[PDB]
Amino acid sequence: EQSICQARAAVMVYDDANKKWVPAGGSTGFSRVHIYHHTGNNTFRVVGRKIQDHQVVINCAIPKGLKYNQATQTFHQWRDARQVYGLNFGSKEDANVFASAMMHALEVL
């Protein structure tokens, strides 16, 4: 696996039942969020770990055809069959870096 980006974000998931975002992994705070490329089958994943205690709070596949919603310049989100994910980026620069790499992934899948 090769990291194609690193971006600072608080990783959220949406709790539909209570219509609230909650911190991924139950752990408030920022993570270092990568997109990793597995070249052997040209697959990509989003993997994020808490800056402080290194807990993996997101590890999801990026499917071909994903709709990546840039809701704001610092909060981007997407959904799959099971969950909705949000990234509250530490800065616009982080959001741009991540969105660049995500859009690249989605274009070569």
Binding site: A10, M12, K20, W21, V22, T28, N88
Partner: peptide, 5 residues
């Protein structure tokens, strides 16, 4: 929201 963050 700040309440969620």
């Amino acid at each position: 929201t700040e309440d969620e963050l």
